[PDB]
Amino acid sequence: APCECDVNGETYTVSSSEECERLCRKLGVTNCRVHCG
Numbered sequence: 001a002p003c004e005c006d007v008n009g010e011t012y013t014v015s016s017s018e019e020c021e022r023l024c025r026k027l028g029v030t031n032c033r034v035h036c037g
Contacts, residue, residue, distance in 0.1 A: 003036035 005012050005020030008031050014020045017034045024032030 001037040003034065006033035006035075007031060 002013050002015060003017055003020065005014045005017075005023060007020075007024045007027055008029050012020075012023065014023060014034075017036060020032065020034040024030075
């Protein structure tokens, strides 16, 4: 399955862990987690 990114406590799906990181940077939130299933 694709990779999942948890920002602010909410869970989103991203193609890559770096995409997660970038997304969190775009939102401007430090609370950001990642795990790829």
